[PDB]
Amino acid sequence: EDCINRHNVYINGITYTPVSSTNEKDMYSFLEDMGLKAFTNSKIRKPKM
Amino acid sequence: SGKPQYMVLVPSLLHTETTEKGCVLLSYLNETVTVSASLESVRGNRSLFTDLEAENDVLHCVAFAVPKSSSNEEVMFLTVQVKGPTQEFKKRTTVMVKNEDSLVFVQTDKSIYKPGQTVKFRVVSMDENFHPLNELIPLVYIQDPKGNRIAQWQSFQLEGGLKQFSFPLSSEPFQGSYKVVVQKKSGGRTEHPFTVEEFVLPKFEVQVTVPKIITILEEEMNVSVCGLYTYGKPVPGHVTVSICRKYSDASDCHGEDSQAFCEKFSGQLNSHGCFYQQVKTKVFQLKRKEYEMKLHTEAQIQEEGTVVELTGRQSSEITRTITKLSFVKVDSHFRQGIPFFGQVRLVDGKGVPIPNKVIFIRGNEANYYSNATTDEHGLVQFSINTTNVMGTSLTVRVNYKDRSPCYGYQWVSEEHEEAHHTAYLVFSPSKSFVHLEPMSHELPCGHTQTVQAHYILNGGTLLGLKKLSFYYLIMAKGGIVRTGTHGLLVKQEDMKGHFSISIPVKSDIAPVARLLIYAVLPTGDVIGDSAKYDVENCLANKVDLSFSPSQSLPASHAHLRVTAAPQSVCALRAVDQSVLLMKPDAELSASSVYNLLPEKDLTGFPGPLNDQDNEDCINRHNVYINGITYTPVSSTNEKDMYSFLEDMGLKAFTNSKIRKPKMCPQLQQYTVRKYFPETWIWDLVVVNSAGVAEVGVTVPDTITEWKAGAFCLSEDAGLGISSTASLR
Amino acid sequence: IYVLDYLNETQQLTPEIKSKAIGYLNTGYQRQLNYKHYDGSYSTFGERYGRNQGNTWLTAFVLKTFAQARAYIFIDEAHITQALIWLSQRQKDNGCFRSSGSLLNNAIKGGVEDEVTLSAYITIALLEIPLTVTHPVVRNALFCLESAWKTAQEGDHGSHVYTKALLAYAFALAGNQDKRKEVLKSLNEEAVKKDNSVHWERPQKPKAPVGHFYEPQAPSAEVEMTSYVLLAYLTAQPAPTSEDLTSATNIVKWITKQQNAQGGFSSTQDTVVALHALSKYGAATFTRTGKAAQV
Amino acid sequence: IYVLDYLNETQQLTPEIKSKAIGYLNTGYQRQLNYKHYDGSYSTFGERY
C-alpha cells in the first residue's frame, strides 16, 4: 500500500518536476529470480508508489 | 570581498522628441566605472550615445533625450557597456521607440447650437508630462455631416498651449450632429462632436431618485421626483412617472412592442417640497426572463404645458448574484517562509457592508480551513503561515459550492458570488526575500505615505559586508518618476523582517503608481517586489475659481477670481447654463485628461519585441533523483524577479541571477436689455504672481445655472482643471 | 535565384524562362512564409501551432536567399528585419550565436554544426546585406570570429579547412584585408592542388571511425567551401587584384568540372554558394561590353 | 486592388500601407492559384483532385 505520491512531487531546489516509475534491481526481485518467496517486515521491496 | 555589481534599468517603450529617464546602480571594488548606453537603429545606421561616470553604491538616474525618427514606430538595439579599470561588461536588447502623438483635445463654448449662432471652440495640445507645448498643427476644421465639411483652417501654430477659433453658423444650416476634427502631423486625427438644431431654453430640470441598483430579492422600491428651477427653487405642477421593465415576451418586430411592463404614477407637484412614492415590484416579475429597468419620468410644468422627460436608472441591476462578498487587500503572491495576511471585504447587492456574519475561508494546497465573521465593516484579516507547495488557492464563501435555490432548472436567475483567488510563490535561490505590505488602494495626492516592508533574510550576507542595501523606484506614465534608496546595518546572521518606507505623493504620478523595491546582497544576489497605488486623479498645478458673489438684478459689477501658478494663462468658460441645463458637456475633467493619455500604465513588453532568452540549460541525462524512484522533467510556474520587472513595464541589464534558471527544451525529436445667453464669458486671462481677478458683467433676464469652467496652463506647473462656479 | 544570377551574368537568358522562374520564386517564397514563426524565425513546420521554437541556421539561409530575391523580385523588408533581430536576440555578449537545433536532416546544412561555423555563416549572411561593420551585431560577431580564428590558428587543428575558409570570407567582407590575407595564406598552405586547378577537401579523410557511405552526418561540403574561398578571394574594397583572380580561376575550373549531369551539384548548399561565386566571378571577369581584346 | 486604385487616384496613399497591401496581394494571388484547374479554369476547390 505504500504510496509516497505527494500532491506535487515536493521536488525542492531550482525547479519542480513530476513523478515516474523506476527501473532497477531490488532484493525482492533477487529472491524472485532466485525462485523462492519470503515473508519479512524489513524494507525488501522498493517503495513503489 | 564579493563579486562586483552593476545594474541598469530602463523602460521598454521609449518616446521620442522628449526626455526619458533611466537609472543605474553601481557598487563593490574597482569603482572607477564608466557606463555608456548606445541606442542604435539597426536597419540603416542610427546611433544615440550616452555616457556617465559611476561610483560605489549609488543609484543615479540620467535623463536621455530622443528626437523624432524617420518612421513612426520602430525597434532599436540598446547596448549598455560597463567599463571598470579591471572589468568589462556588455549587454543589449531590443527597445521599442515610438514617434508618439501628442494628446490634443477640443472644448466648445456650447454643446448644442441654434441657427445663426457662432460656434466658438478651443484646441489644446500636450505631452506626457502636462507641461504646455507649442506646436505647428497642420489641420483643424469644422465639418458638415454629409461630408460637406463646413469650415477649414490650415497650418496654425500654438503658442500659449492653446488656440481659440470661431465660425458663424448661418440662418438655414443643415440640422443634425456636426463635428470638429483636428489632424496632427503624425497623421493622427481627433474628433469632437457637437450638434446643431432648434430648441427652447428650459428653466427647470427634473431630478428623480430610485435605487441605482435594484436586485432580485426586492419586494418594493422607493421612488421620488423633485424639480430644480431658476436658482433651484421649487416648481409647482404635475408629474407622470413611468417606471418600467423593458424587453418582454413579445417578439419585438413590426407588430410587437418591445416595451415590457410599465407603471404610470400621477403626482401633483406641490408648492413646497417634492413628490415621493413607494412602488411594488411584484408586477415587474423581477425573475429569470424579463429584462432591465428604464424609468422615464415626465414632469409637466403648469402655466406653460411644458413637458420634459428624463431617463433614469435604466441599469438597475437585477443581479442573479446576491450576497456578493468581496476582497480588498488580497496579495497576488506569497513565499514558502512567511505568514501572508489577506484582507477581505464582504458586501451584498447595492454595496452596503454586512456586519457580524459567519464566513468560511478555504486554503487549498495549504490545508487551511477556517471560519471567520463579517465585522462592522465586513472586513476580515486572515493570515496563513506559508511553508507549502508552489501554488496556493484561496476561496471564501458564506454559502457553499452550489447555488442554494434551484440552480440547474434552466429557468432561474439566483446566484451567490464566491471569492476566488490564486497566488504563486516567488523564486528565491538565496532563500531570502522581501515582501511589501502595501496600502494597495485609492492613494491620495499632495500627501505623504508610508508603505511597510518585510525582509526575511535566510542568513543574509554570507560573507559580504555589514551594511546591506535596498533601492526603490516609484515609476509612472509608462516611464519612471521618483527614485531613492535605503540601507541597514544587517543583523549578524538572522532574517530581520520589519522596516518602513516613506514617499511623497505631491504629483507627477499617473493614476497608477507602480512602486518596486529591490535589495542587493554583495554575493551577486538580489531580491525585490512590487506594489500598486491607484493615485487619485489630481493635477500638479493647483487651481481654483471663486467669484465676487451671486446677486440678482443685472448689476454688471460681478467678479470672477482664479488662483493658479504665479505666471500663467487661464481659459475661462462661464456659460449661461440653459443649454447646459438641457444637454451636458463632453467629459471635461481631470479623469478625461488622464484617460486621453497614451498607455496610462505600461505592463508587459509591447507586441513586436518578444523577449531576451538565455542559454543556461540544466537538463541532466535524467533528473537525478535518488530515493523512491527517478523523476522526469517539467517546467515550473512561479513568479520571478524578471517577471516583476516585466509586469512593471521596464527592462534591465545585470549579471546576477534574475531570471529563473529555465532549461532548454528536449532536443530529441522525430430696466433691462437682454444680452447674448447660453454662454457668459469665453476668454483667456493672464495670471500674475498673485492670482488673477476679472470683473465680469452681470447680464439680464438670464436665470439658469452659470457653470464656470477653469482650464489653466503654465509652462512650469502644467495644466489645471477647476470647478464650475454657477453664479446664479 | 542563383541560377537566375548565373544566367544573367553569363547573358544566356531568355524572357520565357525568366517569367517561369519568377513564378517559381513567388510560389516558393510564399510556401516558405507558410513555415515561419510569429516572432519572425523559421523552422521545419512552425505555423498552425506554437509548440515549437525556430532554428537559427534556417533563418540565416532564408535571410540570404530573401536578400538575393529582393535583388531580382520584390519582397517585404519586414521579414528580413524580423529575422535579423531574432538572430541578434539569439547572440551572446562574448560567445556567438547558439545552435537552436530544430532541424530534420543535416544534409541540407553544408556545415559541421559547430557554434563557430554557425556564427560565421550567420555573420556572412548578415554582411551580405549591406550592413556597416560598426553595427553592433557584426561587431560582436567579428569578435567571435577573431577569437575563434586565433584559437584555431595557434592550435594544430581547428578543422583545418571549413572554418578557416568561412572565416576568410567573413574577414573579406568586413574589410580586414590583413586578416584576410593571413587566414588565406594559412588555407593556401594546406593545398589540394591538381594538374590545372586547386581545391580543398575535409581533413583529407576523417580521422575517427567514419564512412560506410551516403555522407552520414558529413555531406562532404567540398564544393561549397571551395566556392566560399572563391567568394573570399573575389572580395576587396577598391576592386580585386590579379593574383586572387588567378587562384580564383583555378578553383573555378575545379568547380565547373565538378558539376553534375543531372543538374546542380551534390546538394543544395553547394549548388547555391557555388553558383553565387561563379556569378560574382562573371560580374568581375566576364563583361558584355568589353569586346575588343587584342593579345 | 481596387482599394489601392482608389487611394492612388485620390493621392491618399503612403508607402507603408502600400507594401502591406502588396504582401496581401501576393498571398491571396497564390492562394487563388491553389484552386485553379489543370486547363486554366477555376472552381471552389479544384486542385488536389
Ligand SMILES: *[C@@H]1O[C@H](CO)[C@@H](O[C@@H]2O[C@H](CO)[C@@H](O[C@@H]3O[C@H](CO)[C@@H](O)[C@H](O)[C@@H]3O)[C@H](O)[C@H]2NC(C)=O)[C@H](O)[C@H]1NC(C)=O
Ligand atoms: C543582370 O544584372 C545586371 C547587374 O549586373 C543588370 O544590369 C546591367 O548591369 C550592368 C552592370 O552589372 C550595367 O552596366 C552599366 O553600363 C554603364 C554604361 O551604360 C556603365 O557606366 C556602368 O558602370 C555599368 O557597367 C547595365 O547597364 C545593366 N543593364 C542592362 C545591361 O540592361 C541587368 O539588367 C540584369 N539582367 C536582366 C534584368 O535581364
Ligand SMILES: *[C@@H]1O[C@H](CO)[C@@H](O[C@@H]2O[C@H](CO)[C@@H](O[C@@H]3O[C@H](CO)[C@@H](O)[C@H](O)[C@@H]3O)[C@H](O)[C@H]2NC(C)=O)[C@H](O)[C@H]1NC(C)=O
Ligand atoms: C497611380 O496610377 C497612375 C496611373 O493613373 C500611375 O502612373 C501615373 O500616371 C499619371 C497620369 O495619370 C502620370 O502623370 C503624368 O505626368 C506627365 C508629366 O510629368 C504627363 O505628361 C502625363 O500626361 C501624365 O499626366 C504619372 O507620372 C504616373 N506616375 C505617378 C503618378 O507617379 C502611378 O504610378 C500610380 N502610383 C502608384 C501606383 O503608386
Ligand SMILES: *[C@@H]1O[C@H](CO)[C@@H](O)[C@H](O)[C@H]1NC(C)=O
Ligand atoms: C549614417 O546615417 C546618416 C543619416 O543621414 C548618413 O548621412 C550617414 O552617411 C550614415 N553613415 C555614417 C557613417 O554616418
Ligand SMILES: *[C@@H]1O[C@H](CO)[C@@H](O)[C@H](O)[C@H]1NC(C)=O
Ligand atoms: C577587481 O575585481 C577583481 C574581481 O574579483 C578582484 O579580484 C580584484 O582584486 C580587483 N582589482 C584589481 C584587478 O585591480
Ligand SMILES: *[C@@H]1O[C@H](CO)[C@@H](O)[C@H](O)[C@H]1NC(C)=O
Ligand atoms: C423608502 O421610503 C420609506 C418611507 O416611505 C422609508 O421608511 C425607507 O427607509 C425608504 N428606503 C428604503 C425602503 O430603502
Ligand SMILES: *[C@@H]1O[C@H](CO)[C@@H](O)[C@H](O)[C@H]1NC(C)=O
Ligand atoms: C465556524 O467555527 C466557529 C468556531 O471557531 C463556530 O462558532 C461557527 O459556528 C462555525 N461556523 C458555523 C456556520 O457554525
Ligand SMILES: *[C@@H]1O[C@H](CO)[C@@H](O)[C@H](O)[C@H]1NC(C)=O
Ligand atoms: C506558522 O505555523 C507553522 C506550522 O508549520 C510554524 O512552523 C510557524 O512557526 C508558524 N509561524 C511562526 C511565525 O512561528
